[PDB]
Design an enzyme around this catalytic site. Sequence first.
Site, short mmCIF file in Angstrom:
data_model
loop_
_atom_site.label_atom_id
_atom_site.label_comp_id
_atom_site.label_asym_id
_atom_site.label_seq_id
_atom_site.Cartn_x
_atom_site.Cartn_y
_atom_site.Cartn_z
N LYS A 1 26.04 41.90 29.23
CA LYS A 1 26.50 43.27 29.19
C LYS A 1 25.75 44.02 28.12
O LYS A 1 25.46 45.20 28.31
CB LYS A 1 28.00 43.33 28.97
N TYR B 1 28.53 36.33 29.09
CA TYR B 1 28.99 37.67 29.51
C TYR B 1 28.49 38.72 28.55
O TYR B 1 27.90 39.72 28.98
CB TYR B 1 30.50 37.74 29.56
#
Lengths: 246, 240
Positions: free
Chosen positions: A159, A155
């Site tokens: 991001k 993640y």
Amino acid sequence: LPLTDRIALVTGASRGIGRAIALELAAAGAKVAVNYASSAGAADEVVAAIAAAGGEAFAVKADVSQESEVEALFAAVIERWGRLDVLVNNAGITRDTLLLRMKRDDWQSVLDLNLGGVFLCSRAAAKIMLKQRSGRIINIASVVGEMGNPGQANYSAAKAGVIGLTKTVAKELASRGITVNAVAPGFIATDMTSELAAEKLLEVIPLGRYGEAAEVAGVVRFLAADPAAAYITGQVINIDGGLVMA
Amino acid sequence: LPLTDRIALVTGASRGIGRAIALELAAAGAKVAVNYASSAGAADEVVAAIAAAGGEAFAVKADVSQESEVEALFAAVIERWGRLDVLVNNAGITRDTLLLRMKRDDWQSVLDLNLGGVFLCSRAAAKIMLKQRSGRIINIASVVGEMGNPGQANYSAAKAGVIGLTKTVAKELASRGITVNAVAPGFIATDMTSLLEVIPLGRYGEAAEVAGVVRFLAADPAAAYITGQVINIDGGLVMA
Ligand SMILES: NC(=O)c1ccc[n+]([C@@H]2O[C@H](COP(=O)([O-])OP(=O)(O)OC[C@H]3O[C@@H](n4cnc5c(N)ncnc54)[C@H](OP(=O)(O)O)[C@@H]3O)[C@@H](O)[C@H]2O)c1
């Protein structure tokens, strides 16, 4: 109303932050295309609530990690309304696991959707927006991308990659007045990126609480609609309760 | 010599920055595994030079975007020297184009190597270093990942991602004293690089200069307390 006669496309808008963004852009006068992949009932609710408060919306199904699905997604928006003023890349998933145990498919599916989707949709938006010589793109990244977070190597890589991508696209589209920015939420009460890390870190959220979906949506609306934000580009705004200040 | 009896794997070490890092880590005492993708000769030239300096090295062919090849890469190092002290994720490529015309395959090939390869190798390294309760991982990112750069939406999203991965991995591996850091070169004289008025020091960097920062993080005792960081070696290009 600053988005009257404007079109917004929000990806992954059936719930949480994405739903809140769809509502706030409609509140501000935009016609909103509410994209979903599997949450169709929830997506219909979002359209109904925009209809209810007096706006125009429609739901479009599309898996934003898939190149031809993204093509048909944008084609559907231009066919219904002829233009695209605001794109918010919000669709994302987590597949949390410590790195040691992280399986390749848990890495890949998070990268393809959270980063690849931003690439696919930014590419398609750029074409339309360059032709218009106007537009604003807002990508939802996340403080995990700035600070890292155990369990979330996929993640956070994604991001962070969204933040880098944001800046490059800002530089390529700047000469037409198109702005490209990121909003980096912290832990949001009902759209929690790491429910496990919120608990452990609530003690060091300076403001003492989790954020609300409606708050993230306001920073997004500001970037999308306020004339002052015509001069802001390539930036990341944290809305994180003071979680990450460095 | 701080790296004597330590083992280093450098990915993409046949040329440029990766070559200079392998040479430098060898001069500091390490046995070096020299990964290459197709330059068998250039790779062996680096192995050779290390051996004439009186060091130990060997070359391993692996495309570090491939799960199965990285596994083979790491097994071959463990099988040969039975440990891994330092991983330097250096291999990478560019496929420059404005976003408007970026083909999906040109996005995905840079992403798969420059970011996917860092995930795969750091995962193989985490497994070993957790068992050892020691190790250093150094990722070669790029200042272009911090500030963006027209033409490079793929490379900048991949290098920014390497920086995010670095931080999460640093946090996961900290409790066993493993450091995880990135080095971000600006413009260095290499094949990837073969106006200037925006570099305050007024020149490109040399591959040996990048190699010195990597060696410092890899070998110097003061760097045991540095983790989760990105050090720019870029002549002042990016001040952040
Ligand atoms: N100004 C700069 O040069 C600059 C700035 C910032 C960051 N960097 C980064 O520094 C690192 C080294 O770049 P450089 O300039 O030295 O590169 P450059 O001379 O092309 O050298 C690339 C190296 O990586 C290898 N490689 C390519 N594809 C591979 C794969 N799939 N699997 C394993 N290895 C592969 C190549 O091996 P073969 O010889 O077998 O093909 C070669 O050893 C890269 O991550 C680059 O993005 C460079």
